[PDB]
Design a protein around this ligand. Structure first.
Ligand code: FMN
Ligand code: FMN
Ligand code: YHX
Ligand code: YHX
Ligand code: YHX
Ligand code: YHX
Lengths: 189, 189
């Protein structure tokens, strides 16, 4: 069931590369994004999907050095050890066009775009979990933005929002608590 | 399958009140939110779920008059005709607390909260579609915010982000197009 699918999606930090069918994984990532709703069907989400050598390169040659250079002013090995990383961007050129076409909603499009990024990120995350793969969501933007755009020749208009690290599950999700229903749901008739 | 569940979720404007098991619907809405991820497990989403007399009141006594008063400075009947409306808020008190606790990420929490709102909105939307119910997402915020908070005695900290109108499907979804894969997915190794 759908609710079961949602419950199955969890943050998994212990990831490996025991992935049987990479093509199936790629297909599923694309489908999850494809069937995600966006304001005005604007489809502002953009993905860079890295595996193999590119996965090694992201973490060893971009994230690590950028992070070090920043801090000055382990975990990374665990991210690198995963099968791949899905970098989620929002296309600002489309956002700006929407703002120009529908001036009435100009202030709203950045908001709906952020919402869109969350939407496709978790739909992909949940779809991967259905395949039995784990993932965790990271935010090394904006530190790595320029290096990533240069290495993989991305349009300047792609604004990095998140990085979903994914692979085989090598240890179970941790414990998680939930709010009291009474504090977040009100039902009225 | 999960991808099938995603594909089944569509914007349905023609909605009615042929809903067989309201309690099951409420349970499913709660579960979809419960099992949705949020930054720091902050669970900032808040829901006001209206049906029956409250559904009539929202659209006739709040949205209509506010909208008229604004414009001065049909569709509404179609929204009212639905079984209910799920109003999605983000709790700004929790957001502000996060900003204070983790000053390093202060600018990020509003962003992750917006992403969170998108996340729970579509998870609820998709869960309703699995039950065979249709829905559409509207944005009469911030116009109706104050009236809604007063009528249902909501905390000032609840910031309205969207209103998901839902009910029985009375006409099929319209046609929808998709981008070229090549323009939004890059795969590298
Ligand atoms: C963040 C967001 C905001 C949306 N806002 C509205 C809205 O205010 N009014 C409306 O009728 N539809 C709204 N939509 C629905 C989209 O237009 C719709 O999802 C998109 O055209 C894809 O069609 P589908 O929902 O049938 O898949 C919104 C969707 C998203 C994801
Ligand atoms: C918008 C958003 C941003 C998140 N950012 C991070 C992050 O930067 N690093 C991380 O390790 N987890 C991150 N998480 C994961 C959440 O902490 C996690 O989803 C939450 O604690 C619930 O746990 P679960 O994913 O196992 O259900 C993020 C989740 C969401 C929805
Ligand atoms: O009809 N509308 O005004 C409309 C349609 C579709 N989407 O996505 C919208 C999104 C935001 C505001 C109005 C929208
Ligand atoms: O191996 N990791 O990357 C890792 C393990 C455990 N926790 O809690 C983490 C938390 C945040 C980022 C990476 C983590
Ligand atoms: O370990 N972290 O830094 C971490 C854990 C969980 N969430 O949700 C985070 C979210 C944003 C930034 C860092 C996060
Ligand atoms: O009945 N409606 O509310 C309705 C019908 C058709 N479209 O396209 C709509 C579009 C936006 C809002 C309401 C709509």
């Amino acid at each position: 069931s759908f609710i079961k699918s949602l419950e199955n999606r969890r943050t998994i930090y212990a990831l490996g590369r025991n992935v049987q069918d990479e093509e199936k994984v790629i297909e599923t990532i694309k489908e999850a994004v494809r069937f995600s709703p966006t304001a005005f069907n604007s489809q502002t989400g953009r993905l860079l999907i890295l595996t193999g050598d590119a996965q090694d390169k992201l973490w060893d040659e971009i994230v690590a050095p950028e992070l070090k250079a920043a801090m000055e002013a382990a975990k990374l090995d665990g991210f690198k050890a995963a099968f791949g990383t899905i970098l989620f961007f929002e296309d600002q050129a489309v956002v700006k066009n929407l703002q120009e076409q529908f001036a009435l909603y100009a202030d709203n499009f950045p908001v709906w775009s952020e919402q869109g990024s969350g939407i496709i990120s978790v739909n992909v995350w949940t779809a991967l979990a259905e395949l039995g793969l784990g993932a965790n969501l990271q935010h090394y933007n904006p530190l790595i933005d320029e290096a990533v755009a240069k290495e993989w020749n991305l349009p300047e208009s792609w604004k990095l929002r998140g990085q979903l690290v994914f692979g085989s599950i090598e240890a179970p999700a941790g414990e998680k608590t939930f709010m009291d229903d009474a504090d977040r749901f009100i039902v009225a008739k």
